[PDB]
Ligand binder design. Structure first.
Ligand SMILES: Nc1ncnc2c1ncn2[C@@H]1O[C@H](COS(=O)(=O)NC(=O)[C@@H](N)Cc2ccc(O)cc2)[C@@H](O)[C@H]1O
Ligand SMILES: Nc1ncnc2c1ncn2[C@@H]1O[C@H](COS(=O)(=O)NC(=O)[C@@H](N)Cc2ccc(O)cc2)[C@@H](O)[C@H]1O
Lengths: 318, 318
């Protein structure tokens, strides 16, 4: 039902159990979540993909759970990460964490009644948890042998000079517990994220089973990348952030206008909430027409409105 | 000096930096330590070897530091262990810690003067340590790449019949920190133990250097075994404990008095404080004499007195 709708938009990289998941969603409204680690004082285009999916699920009658890694942001996710990561101060991260929680709120409904979104921070439980308690209660459920063969960290253990500290090596467990922890208190039976989080989701699905005996699910979204294969979220000396202070609403609207034809339509399915029909109708429209493709104009006005509202939209034109 | 003296009686299997350690020991009195994890309500003959070396070191004017792993006892040292060591309740380990601590006290002098022994417990700094603090403050200094090639655990990894959990895989770090922690609060520059503890000692030496820029040392005593080869401190009633309640002084004395002629002398160098001379004069004595080797007698006399004193000695004779 819903999963297939997302597949139409091309926002479905993988699914742990496409049938049971599709069935559970049928039985009734479920609660899912997606994590966001503090690596800056603001999120960017890349992050906007998963976040938007949550809203998609919510409009479908589901309850989204946007979580901020106040704790995981202090260790670093090595998932398909070329090299080690910086250990930001406990204060700097806290400052960012508080900026993310507020930057995410507007994107979700926090009072729509039943499926009201909920903001969570893994620091709440990892920020006062003992080390021995962690290793014992959570670590005993992990095999180093299989932790090594996980793609997310594969290269980092085999390769020439790609190493990995014990710090980021345990990240997997942290995000793993998060799933179970959220499932235990909020009944979250689904987690979504980029294709690079598949390994972390898996661990979360497994742990939850041997911890609460609950069949949980995971759904990764494909990592968005420009047709010209040039990553995403970043352009020149400044990755397009969501904070209008780091990326002027005017500079934001311009970024979309500059979208290549080989992407514009694919981007509309990923960053807007337009029915796949009116989107394909727009493509077939720009095709037959001998005029300039108005797809970008649409794509720019849509996203700019979602991130900066009518205000920023009118600001990007003055 | 003292190093070679220990070599004379085969109590030294490995030494990190024999040279530097030699000069340091000569420079003046130092502070060493040896850990003993609570895996039972009592210690056995095997644990007695390293414990005695602490006193031997103390008689040399150095200060021994007998540490009880009130925390590590909850994790489990996998050093050269084929299987996963089951987890004991904090209530049980705590109950064992007290017994071991009081059982160790007698063996060391806790009020002779300056070189008074110290009773340490890693639970003091690991029991109230946040997981996030541990993972980064310590974990960042450890490389999974080299943790995997560690002899102590290389068995549990490169096998398809065995396996190691994240719990015991993180043990090394705990012991590593202990050395650094002790060196920072007591100035402990040396750690001793069985050859199986070499890996844990080394890790504690590099960690101390990376966190305090100090050069500590490590010395491991050979894992004493029986001539035939069978494990040491193991009989039909299980193992030979230092706890009278578990192993009567009578049964304790009989174990020694029944020592093979090929071990009786080594054991005298390992379990007693008789000068290497009188020990050799004793061996030379038995060598050529129609009588029966009185080495066994001497052995059972000495050891039994060190573990159960006069009371337990006269108890074995009745
Ligand atoms: N270009 C892109 N296209 C699609 N998705 C993208 C993307 N760029 C980033 N993302 C996704 O958007 C999110 C960005 O935040 S993130 O720093 O990568 N998140 C993480 O690293 C997770 N470990 C955070 C986390 C998740 C769950 C937890 O229980 C705890 C922590 C991730 O889901 C990432 O996969
Ligand atoms: N038969 C034997 N001959 C000689 N030495 C022996 C022996 N049997 C055991 N030993 C040694 O005597 C001690 C017995 O206690 S133990 O439970 O094995 N100790 C451990 O496992 C350590 N990991 C404990 C530890 C040590 C230091 C720390 O900072 C923290 C913990 C160890 O040093 C062991 O190597």
């Amino acid at each position: 039902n819903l999963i297939k709708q997302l597949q139409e938009r091309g926002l479905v990289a993988q699914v742990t159990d496409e049938e049971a998941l599709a069935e559970r969603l049928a039985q009734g409204p479920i609660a899912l979540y997606c994590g966001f680690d503090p690596t800056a004082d603001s999120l960017h285009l890349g992050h906007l993909v998963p976040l938007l999916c949550l809203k998609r699920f919510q409009q479908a009658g589901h309850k989204p759970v946007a979580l901020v890694g106040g704790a995981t942001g202090l260790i670093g996710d090595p998932s398909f990460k070329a090299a080690e990561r910086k250990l930001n101060t406990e204060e700097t991260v806290q400052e960012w964490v508080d900026k993310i929680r507020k930057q995410v709120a507007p994107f979700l409904d926090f009072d729509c009644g039943e499926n009201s979104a909920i903001a969570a921070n893994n620091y709440d439980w990892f920020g006062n948890m003992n080390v021995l308690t962690f290793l014992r209660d959570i670590g005993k459920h992990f095999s180093v042998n299989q932790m090594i063969n996980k793609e997310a960290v594969k290269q980092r253990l085999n390769r020439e000079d790609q190493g990995i500290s014990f710090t980021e090596f345990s990240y997997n467990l942290l995000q793993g517990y998060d799933f179970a922890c959220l499932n235990k208190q909020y009944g979250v039976v689904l987690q979504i994220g980029g294709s690079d989080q598949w390994g972390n989701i898996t661990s979360g699905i497994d742990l939850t089973r041997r911890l609460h005996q609950n069949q949980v699910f995971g759904l990764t979204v494909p990592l968005i990348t420009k047709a010209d294969g040039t990553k995403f979220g970043k352009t020149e000396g400044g990755a397009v952030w969501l904070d209008p202070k780091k990326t002027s609403p005017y500079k934001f609207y311009q970024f979309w206008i500059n979208t290549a034809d080989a992407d514009v339509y694919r981007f509309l399915k990923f960053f807007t909430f337009m029915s796949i029909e009116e989107i394909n109708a727009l493509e077939e429209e720009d095709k037959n027409s001998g005029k300039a493709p108005r797809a970008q104009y649409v794509l720019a006005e849509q996203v700019t409105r979602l991130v900066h509202g009518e205000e920023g939209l009118q600001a990007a034109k003055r």
